[PDB]
Symmetry: C2
Subunit: 159 residues, 2 copies
């Protein structure tokens, strides 16, 4: 799994939308109740160089907002978390203005816990971003891949 070189984490700040999702195990994304079925609303980088990830997630028959604190590490573009039974956030690529690709995994069991997403800044299907997502997914052993249509992209998590 190759991460991004020369990530300036301050420039990913602002609103985002989850466009596409992929995972190594089907049950990680199967249904809205799935453990890693999460929709990113906002990335908030901190002065220390950490990354706060604001997202929506299905729980108790409703979409609830969660904040995840990703601590920076000695490896660039890799952040430590303690949520969703995952411990690492990996930023694969971003142009800052349009798209951002990232993955979540558990270091102990990366084959059974790898979930990757393609984010966009506006709720519009960007074919360029999807091409870069699929290109990055070639090396990884993914068993499920999702891509939201324009309607679903606007709705994100919803009942």
């Amino acid at each position: 799994t190759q991460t991004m070189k020369g990530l300036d984490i301050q420039k990913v700040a602002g609103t985002w939308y989850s466009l596409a999702m992929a995972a190594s195990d089907i049950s990680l994304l199967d249904a809205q109740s799935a453990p890693l079925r999460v929709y990113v609303e906002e990335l908030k980088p901190t002065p220390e160089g950490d990354l706060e990830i604001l997202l929506q997630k299905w729980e108790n028959g409703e979409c609830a907002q969660k904040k995840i604190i990703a601590e920076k590490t000695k490896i660039p573009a890799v952040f430590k978390i303690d949520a969703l039974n995952e411990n690492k956030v990996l930023v694969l690529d971003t142009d800052y203005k349009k798209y951002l690709l990232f993955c979540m995994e558990n270091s102990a069991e990366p084959e059974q816990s790898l979930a990757c997403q393609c984010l966009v800044r506006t709720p519009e299907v960007d074919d360029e971003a999807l091409e870069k997502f699929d290109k990055a997914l070639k090396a990884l052993p993914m068993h499920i891949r999702l891509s939201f249509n324009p309607t679903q992209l606007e709705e994100q998590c919803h009942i």
Copy 2:
């Protein structure tokens, strides 16, 4: 959507397993409760040239067996059904001995109803069949794609 030329429907008879699934709309396969989340157990061709499709499907908190009668039509490899809010079964390709690729759709709304599967005769992940599945999927506008691991392939529909 291009169907198979020279299909001998008698030779698809016997046990099958659903290896991979793809659909044009996410909600068609999202979760076991999804309308087109079906697992093919057996294909039974009839003397008239029809195709009985035996499958398992989630309903009322349990996997229930369903039989679908696919009537042959003036087009080879295309069969008429009246189930799952679909009206057509399309056989894309098969070698008879290992794999079979097929799709289901509603003629009225093919973009919102297209669901395609890759079947294998034994519960073992066949990379060759998946390559042919993905090759056939290139032309179609799929928004979700699933591929079962060895464990899931053996379980098919299960609580």
